[PDB]
């Protein structure tokens, strides 16, 4: 059956802006994140602070094309950008010393997206 795509106008605008930014800066990170975001809602990626702790490094930038959940513990200092955060997840990210930002803020801080790691 047809994939109608996200119903959220904010998410659709974010996807369009992501593709435009990729074209502007001549990279592939943002287009990759865009086609990952437009995944079917029954397959959207959700990641846990446990996985972030397992595979991240201090002072590193992570992009989650989906949701970040707060099951486990985080001990690294990391800057994570994701579509949505749970209350526990964001609290743990902040208490670990990192920051929980949005994809728009991630682009604004790092237009070229150098050193950013995708997690699903």
């Amino acid at each position: 059956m047809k994939r109608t795509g996200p119903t959220d106008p904010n998410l659709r605008r974010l996807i369009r802006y992501l593709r435009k930014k990729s074209n502007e800066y001549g990279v592939k990170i943002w287009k990759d994140v865009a086609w990952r975001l437009e995944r079917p809602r029954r397959q959207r990626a959700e990641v846990n602070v446990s996985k972030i702790n397992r595979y991240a490094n201090d002072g590193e930038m992570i992009v989650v094309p989906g949701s970040v959940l707060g099951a486990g513990k985080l001990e690294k200092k990391v800057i994570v950008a994701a579509w949505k955060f749970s209350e526990t997840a964001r609290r743990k990210i902040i208490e670990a010393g990192g920051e929980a930002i949005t994809i728009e803020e991630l682009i604004e801080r790092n237009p070229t997206g150098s050193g950013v790691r995708i997690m699903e």
Binding site: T4, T7, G72, K73
Partner: protein, 147 residues
């Protein structure tokens, strides 16, 4: 949020509604038996389906003790003991009472299993323990007391 129309509205005008020949879709004979009919006991129309998709459909298995006599034992993991140790402070399940940290697991869970890791030392007052759970706690530094 996504709303659509039923397939009948599109099928209006197809003369069969996607059921094949006009002679199909009649009744019990079309279904080959009403309900679970013909699953193998007396008639074997759906025996081929039974022997693959629903094994053990026909037959008996062991017994089961009455629900009354069965005893229920709540079980927790040392991974949870550490992960949710902060929450127990609010409800008082854990407290300081001196230098050490005392957690009474008698109001939730009875036996402690040994899956995960222990990070901070503590004393848990439980009634049952697992070999790996007690080994993990002793290695970490805490203690296991059989309250």
């Amino acid at each position: 949020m996504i709303r659509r129309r039923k397939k009948v509205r599109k099928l209006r005008g197809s003369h069969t509604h996607g059921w094949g020949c006009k002679k199909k879709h009649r009744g019990g004979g079309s279904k080959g038996g009403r309900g679970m009919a013909g699953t193998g006991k007396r008639n074997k129309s759906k025996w081929t389906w039974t022997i693959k998709y629903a094994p053990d459909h026909l037959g008996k298995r062991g017994f089961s003790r009455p629900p009354e006599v069965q005893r229920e034992v709540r079980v927790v993991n040392l991974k949870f003991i550490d992960e949710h140790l902060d929450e127990l402070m609010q409800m008082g399940i854990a407290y300081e009472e001196g230098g050490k940290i005392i957690v009474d697991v008698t109001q939730f869970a009875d036996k402690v299993l040994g899956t995960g890791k222990l990070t901070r030392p503590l004393v848990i007052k439980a009634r049952a323990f697992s070999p790996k759970a007690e080994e993990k706690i002793k290695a970490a530094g805490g203690e296991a007391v059989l309250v």
